[PDB]
Write an enzyme that holds these catalytic residues in place. Structure first.
Site, PDB file in Angstrom:
ATOM      1  N   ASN A 169       0.842  -1.190   0.000  1.00 36.43           N
ATOM      2  CA  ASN A 169       0.000   0.000   0.000  1.00 36.43           C
ATOM      3  C   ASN A 169       0.882   1.246   0.000  1.00 36.43           C
ATOM      4  O   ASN A 169       1.519   1.554   1.003  1.00 36.43           O
ATOM      5  CB  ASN A 169      -0.903  -0.017   1.241  1.00 36.43           C
ATOM      6  CG  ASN A 169      -1.777   1.221   1.356  1.00 36.43           C
ATOM      7  OD1 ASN A 169      -1.930   1.991   0.402  1.00 36.43           O
ATOM      8  ND2 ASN A 169      -2.366   1.408   2.530  1.00 36.43           N
TER       9      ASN A 169
ATOM     10  N   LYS B 230      -0.151   4.236  -0.161  1.00 36.89           N
ATOM     11  CA  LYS B 230      -0.869   5.282   0.562  1.00 36.89           C
ATOM     12  C   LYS B 230      -0.800   6.571  -0.269  1.00 36.89           C
ATOM     13  O   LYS B 230      -0.723   6.505  -1.495  1.00 36.89           O
ATOM     14  CB  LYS B 230      -0.273   5.483   1.962  1.00 36.89           C
ATOM     15  CG  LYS B 230      -0.381   4.228   2.837  1.00 36.89           C
ATOM     16  CD  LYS B 230       0.049   4.477   4.276  1.00 36.89           C
ATOM     17  CE  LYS B 230      -0.115   3.205   5.113  1.00 36.89           C
ATOM     18  NZ  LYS B 230       0.307   3.391   6.530  1.00 36.89           N
TER      19      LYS B 230
ATOM     20  N   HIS C 246      -9.219   0.413   5.406  1.00 38.30           N
ATOM     21  CA  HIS C 246      -7.916   0.671   6.005  1.00 38.30           C
ATOM     22  C   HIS C 246      -8.176   1.536   7.237  1.00 38.30           C
ATOM     23  O   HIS C 246      -8.977   2.473   7.186  1.00 38.30           O
ATOM     24  CB  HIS C 246      -6.993   1.398   5.013  1.00 38.30           C
ATOM     25  CG  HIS C 246      -5.553   1.383   5.420  1.00 38.30           C
ATOM     26  ND1 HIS C 246      -5.037   2.244   6.367  1.00 38.30           N
ATOM     27  CD2 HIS C 246      -4.534   0.564   5.066  1.00 38.30           C
ATOM     28  CE1 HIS C 246      -3.766   1.955   6.580  1.00 38.30           C
ATOM     29  NE2 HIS C 246      -3.435   0.936   5.803  1.00 38.30           N
TER      30      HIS C 246
ATOM     31  N   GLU D  85      -6.732   3.927   8.536  1.00 44.70           N
ATOM     32  CA  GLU D  85      -6.547   5.361   8.377  1.00 44.70           C
ATOM     33  C   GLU D  85      -7.879   5.980   7.956  1.00 44.70           C
ATOM     34  O   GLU D  85      -8.224   7.078   8.383  1.00 44.70           O
ATOM     35  CB  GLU D  85      -5.435   5.633   7.361  1.00 44.70           C
ATOM     36  CG  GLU D  85      -4.092   5.135   7.879  1.00 44.70           C
ATOM     37  CD  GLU D  85      -2.969   5.174   6.861  1.00 44.70           C
ATOM     38  OE1 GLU D  85      -3.240   5.366   5.653  1.00 44.70           O
ATOM     39  OE2 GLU D  85      -1.804   4.988   7.283  1.00 44.70           O
TER      40      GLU D  85
ATOM     41  N   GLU E 188      -4.167  -5.265  10.933  1.00 47.75           N
ATOM     42  CA  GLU E 188      -3.155  -4.247  11.179  1.00 47.75           C
ATOM     43  C   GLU E 188      -3.463  -3.521  12.478  1.00 47.75           C
ATOM     44  O   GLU E 188      -4.300  -2.615  12.503  1.00 47.75           O
ATOM     45  CB  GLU E 188      -3.121  -3.214  10.044  1.00 47.75           C
ATOM     46  CG  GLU E 188      -2.555  -3.717   8.738  1.00 47.75           C
ATOM     47  CD  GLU E 188      -2.271  -2.592   7.761  1.00 47.75           C
ATOM     48  OE1 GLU E 188      -1.314  -2.723   6.971  1.00 47.75           O
ATOM     49  OE2 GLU E 188      -3.005  -1.580   7.775  1.00 47.75           O
TER      50      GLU E 188
ATOM     51  N   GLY F  22       2.510   2.732  10.854  1.00 47.03           N
ATOM     52  CA  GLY F  22       3.413   3.862  10.702  1.00 47.03           C
ATOM     53  C   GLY F  22       4.206   4.266  11.935  1.00 47.03           C
ATOM     54  O   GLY F  22       4.886   5.296  11.923  1.00 47.03           O
TER      55      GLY F  22
ATOM     56  N   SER G 127       3.912  -1.832  10.267  1.00 46.55           N
ATOM     57  CA  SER G 127       5.354  -1.800  10.479  1.00 46.55           C
ATOM     58  C   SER G 127       6.060  -3.067  10.013  1.00 46.55           C
ATOM     59  O   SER G 127       7.144  -3.388  10.494  1.00 46.55           O
ATOM     60  CB  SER G 127       5.672  -1.546  11.959  1.00 46.55           C
ATOM     61  OG  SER G 127       5.203  -0.267  12.364  1.00 46.55           O
TER      62      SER G 127
END
Lengths: 255, 255
Positions: free
Chosen positions: B10, B12, B95, B97, B169, B175, B215
């Site tokens: 990904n 992003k 996701h 985010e 995740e 991140g 990560s």
């Protein structure tokens, strides 16, 4: 103290690769005067295809949305940097479909616009009231609140207003075929001019373009374009058809 | 009863046209076995550029997000139809985010996935708990709730689960460099297997891929890939680097 006419075509979530190639080609093949700004906004995944097909020296390509952060961990989002890297200089922000259907708040739209403007892009900032808000006699209150959120973000940096094109699209006119009458539209644009004069600058109100959107098409755009405070149109459905080129001609001949 | 390994990258909201061309070229130049699924997800405006640069017969391109409506008046959104028209068969949905930062609800993610799945696409459905939820000992409750929302939309149409790749995740690992230990990850994947067995089908739990993300990189993916229930990885930052190719090799040699 007048203005450079402006007509934008928002394709929204429509089109295939072949449609984009053909439609952009047909628009680009149309004679576009240097006296009017003409911009079309294809869906994000179609941007490159549209750019490749745009053989016009006047036609400009725009994005339908952009995020309020730069490049980073924002899955599914597009940054201003990406748009500029692609050679794009225009972007639509705060379209009512995102505000009303997707939860984009007044402040988020304002922050997206500010970031785009600070980096040098031209922003088509949309505002508009719903049927219920108008029925509640809150038309101007709402439109002004949405504009104020942007004013809060830009505030002092007035100069940034130079690259702002306000698009008034009453929500009850979006995709419904229920276009506003010239009087209804002009009345709101008048109220927006007044707000700009008071909260921004008398000089700036004379220059900023304020376009009308919401069921605008080939058969009704002339009467709207004849209104002093209506500098052009933000075209939705009609921008996907050959009549979009007619609207360009009508706008040119009118102002 | 095992599985075809899976590794997704990904990107992003990162990259320029030149980066996409070069990076995709470098990935495509790497030897990719027919035994492992390798997918990369560039930003929407970069999709066409990535496709053009992908000279690999194995590498597949995916989108980072998609809307829950077909073509229509959804300014700024992308439809499944657009992705398929472009030849894409993979798409990331839910996701964290988007869930945690952009307000994408459990049901919206579920509806997006269902629409994509019904049309024949493969969906990388993300789930994960925050640091506070884990501290509150609600890790499994949350992950299961997110999976249940999807279960509600698919429910009976179990077969649609065939094209679903679950990506666990933990949000505290996204991140932050704070990757989960093999034990922490495997423990959650075990709980997800159990949920699948109970709410979907024992047979299906044996086939569905469940990948780890957060990560994940070249120096820690081997120990994670050795865990029975970890079928691969959803790589974020590391997918933008040459180490992504190393991760592909490690995944191949490991399972």
């Amino acid at each position: 103290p007048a203005r450079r006419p402006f007509i934008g075509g928002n394709f929204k979530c429509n089109g295939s690769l072949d449609f984009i190639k053909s439609h952009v080609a047909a628009i680009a093949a149309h004679k576009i005067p240097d006296s009017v700004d003409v911009v079309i906004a294809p869906s994000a995944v179609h941007l490159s295809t549209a750019i490749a097909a745009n053989t016009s020296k006047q036609l400009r390509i725009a994005a339908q949305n952009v995020y309020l952060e730069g490049n980073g961990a924002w899955t599914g989002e597009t940054s201003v940097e990406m748009l500029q890297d692609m050679g794009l200089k225009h972007v639509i922000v705060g379209h009512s479909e995102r505000r009303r259907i997707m939860g984009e708040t007044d402040e988020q739209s304002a922050k997206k616009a500010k970031r785009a403007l600070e980096k040098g892009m031209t922003v088509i900032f949309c505002v508009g009231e719903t049927l219920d808000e108008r029925k509640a006699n809150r038309t101007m209150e709402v439109n002004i609140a949405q504009l104020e959120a942007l004013g809060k973000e830009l505030g002092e940096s007035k100069m940034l207003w130079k690259e702002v094109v306000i698009a008034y699209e009453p929500v009850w006119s979006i995709g419904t075929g229920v276009v506003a009458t010239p009087e209804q539209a002009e009345e709101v644009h008048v109220g927006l001019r007044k707000w700009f004069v008071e909260k921004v600058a008398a000089e700036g109100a004379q220059h900023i373009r304020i376009i009308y959107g919401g069921s605008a098409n080939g058969s009704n755009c002339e009467k709207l374009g004849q209104c002093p405070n209506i500098d052009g149109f933000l075209v939705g459905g009609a921008s996907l058809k050959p009549e979009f080129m007619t609207m360009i001609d009508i706008l040119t001949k009118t102002r």
